[PDB]
């Protein structure tokens, strides 16, 4: 990911193919696989994409030029340079030519035409249709160019009323109204366009970004909602994207949701942002997940498939995230196993028991490491995310099937497994299960074990002890309490939660070789202290007068200047 070194490697590969002076097919394949790895590793901005396109086009790679320009126009939205280059490539073709070049013409019309820097595309399209004998088609594209806010709309309008000697202003009022409308549009647009061009220059700062300028220009494109913005804000935002920023995509999706455009557009922008944004952002991408959850009710089939593809990609890139699995299981039981209250109860019970079966066979197959690729759950399941599949099984057995013995059997079984033993939702579910029965024997044994055998976060242990104190005081009496006390442990359910509130390794049950002594004043720094072995400062003087005082015995005089430090940070981290 040394991208500048990769640019030099690609440059030296191209230069070694060019300085071997032959085809250099070994070096050509090396340079091409290097550019493939560079595009698959980095953004492929228009200069290296154009260089690879020039080298490939000189190597007679027409169809491969069409494909790499497709993934290149995928990885530059403002690429009227690559569009125009693509249009030239599109102009020279075979039997499907006059369609495929014009298909790319309407494509660049959809992708780049609404910006003020798009005039060479409409000029090239006019040149192509003027090379054809379809004067109506050239005039139709001319009627398109008069209605768009570009830089040189006036030169285009005069050229439109001078090139059309045969049919100049057959509809005069509409043409002049579109020309004056585009001129007012360019007049209003030239304010922020000039605010952009008076800041945009590569000077290695935020002025290189024109970030405040582009943000104010896009915010100007937010308020003036005359729906041309639906084309133009992309013409804003793509121009904002060329020089990825997450808050830009959130503003863009938010405004497209405000306009209530068709949901395939918002899904398209979401998939674009899901591809282009680097990892570990988690903020647009959860917002897309919650977007699918809201828009699910409308379609019920298409959004489930988008959701499953998305959550699979996420669990591959964010495997320690637990919330993806809960969302997957809720969408699983809400889509694939659909009840409702209308149906007969023998039908409602069956969907619940089938959900219990897919859950239990999925975990039983994962523990024995036998992944059935047919079930998508076992593809997703993970040694971080296993316990929450278990918790869904427990929660469905106890609450829906109302089957207490199978629930208690599952707690005994999966209590011991290493992957799910130190698991928060498992033990908070155990606490709600044994809390719903009143019984205090399992709850007292639980809050004894929260330090020694059960290893939970300190916040979660603090919560379990505070809530169990409030539960115990409100729901039990002095008889049960005084029976709960045995002084061999000094456990008592009212005071012991208070004493062990923040001490995780609390148990109640020569003191100079201990490490508490040795680093008493200064923590982390351990020193043997000189001390008098027989020290009389506990003795009162009235009893010391009785018999003559022994001479002192000592300890550790040699070590007053040696102090030792267990420097884990230097060794384990800097020295690695």
């Amino acid at each position: 990911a040394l991208r500048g070194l990769d640019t030099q490697f690609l440059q030296d590969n191209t230069a070694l193919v060019q300085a071997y002076r032959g085809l250099d097919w070994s070096d050509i394949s090396s340079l091409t696989q290097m550019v493939d790895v560079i595009e698959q590793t980095v953004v492929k901005y228009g200069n290296p994409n154009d260089s690879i396109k020039l080298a490939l086009e000189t190597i007679l790679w027409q169809i491969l030029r069409k494909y790499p320009l497709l993934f290149g126009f995928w990885k530059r939205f403002a690429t009227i340079e690559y569009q125009l280059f693509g249009l030239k490539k599109s102009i020279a073709v075979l039997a499907t030519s006059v369609k495929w070049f014009p298909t790319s013409l309407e494509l660049w019309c959809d992708y780049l035409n609404v910006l003020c820097v798009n005039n060479p595309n409409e000029t090239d399209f006019i040149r192509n249709n003027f090379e054809i004998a379809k004067d109506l088609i050239g005039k139709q594209f001319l009627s398109h160019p008069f209605w768009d806010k570009f830089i040189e709309f006036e030169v285009g309008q005069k050229n439109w009323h001078n090139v059309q000697r045969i049919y100049e202003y057959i509809i005069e009022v509409p043409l002049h109204q579109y020309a004056r409308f585009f001129t007012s549009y360019k007049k209003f647009l030239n304010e922020k366009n000039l605010k952009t061009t008076r800041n945009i220059d590569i000077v290695l700062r935020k002025t290189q970004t024109t970030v405040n300028e582009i943000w104010q220009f896009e915010s100007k494109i937010k308020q003036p909602f005359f729906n041309l913005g639906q084309v133009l804000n992309d013409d804003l935002e793509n121009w904002s994207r060329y020089l990825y920023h997450e808050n830009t995509w959130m503003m863009y999706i938010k405004w497209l949701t405000k306009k209530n455009i068709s949901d395939e557009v918002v899904v398209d922008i979401y998939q674009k942002a899901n591809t282009f944004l680097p990892l570990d952002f988690k903020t647009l991408r959860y917002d897309f997940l919650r977007f699918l959850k809201r828009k699910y009710r409308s379609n019920n089939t298409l959004f489930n498939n988008i959701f499953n593809e998305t959550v699979s990609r996420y669990l591959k890139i964010w495997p320690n995230d637990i919330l993806l699995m809960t969302e997957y299981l809720c969408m699983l039981k809400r889509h694939s196993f659909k009840n409702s209250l209308d149906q007969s109860p023998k039908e409602i019970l069956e969907k619940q028991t089938s959900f219990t079966k897919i859950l239990e066979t999925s975990i039983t197959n994962y523990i024995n490491n036998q992944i059935d690729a047919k079930v998508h759950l076992q593809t997703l399941i993970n040694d971080k995310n296993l316990s929450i599949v278990v918790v869904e099984l427990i929660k469905t057995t106890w609450l829906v099937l109302k089957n207490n013995m199978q629930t208690r059997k599952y707690f005994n079984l999966y209590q011991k497994n290493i992957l799910i033993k130190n698991s928060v939702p498992f033990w908070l579910t155990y606490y709600k299960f044994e809390k719903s029965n009143v019984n205090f024997t399992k709850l007292n044994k639980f809050i004894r074990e929260l330090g020694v055998e059960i290893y939970l976060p300190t916040t979660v242990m603090n919560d379990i002890l505070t809530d169990y104190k409030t539960f115990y005081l409100t729901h039990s009496n002095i008889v049960t309490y005084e029976s709960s006390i045995i002084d061999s442990n000094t456990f008592d359910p009212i005071l012991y939660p208070e004493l062990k509130m923040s001490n995780p390794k609390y148990d109640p049950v020569d003191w100079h070789k201990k490490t508490e002594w040795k680093e008493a004043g200064h923590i982390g720094i351990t020193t043997e202290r000189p001390q008098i072995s027989n020290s009389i400062i506990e003795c009162n003087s009235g009893t010391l007068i009785q018999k003559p005082i022994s001479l002192p015995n000592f300890r550790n005089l040699e070590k007053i200047n040696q102090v030792k430090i267990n420097d884990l940070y230097t060794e384990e981290f800097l020295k690695e």
Binding site: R334, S340, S436
Partner: protein, 133 residues
Amino acid sequence: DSQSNGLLNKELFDKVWKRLSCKEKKSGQEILLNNLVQFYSKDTVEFVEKNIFQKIIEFGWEYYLQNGMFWNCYCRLIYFDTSRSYLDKRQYIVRKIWPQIDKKFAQSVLPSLTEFCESYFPEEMDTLEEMFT
């Protein structure tokens, strides 16, 4: 079943109701409801449902009705009853409880109520979303 009546004693329940009746002047309303929920038995659930849930319904106190935690505690009272069967409690929550809340209050109640629904009723999660949009 020797279920010791904690806050359901006439000396203590009168203090709890007298603090619940002040509605915004006092401070600790949701903690007090959320501990009154914890009884999990048919006789205890019926008393708690009738005295603090039905009664704050019929008095129409807007503080409690617009508040999501009130409805969430009421659903969680009924759903964790060891007496009622599954169809009974799902029937009660969706059919009896959820119509009673007003549709003006939806923007206040739907964050919490969804969080109940996805936790326990993924199947009925359409119904809720249909009832309030």
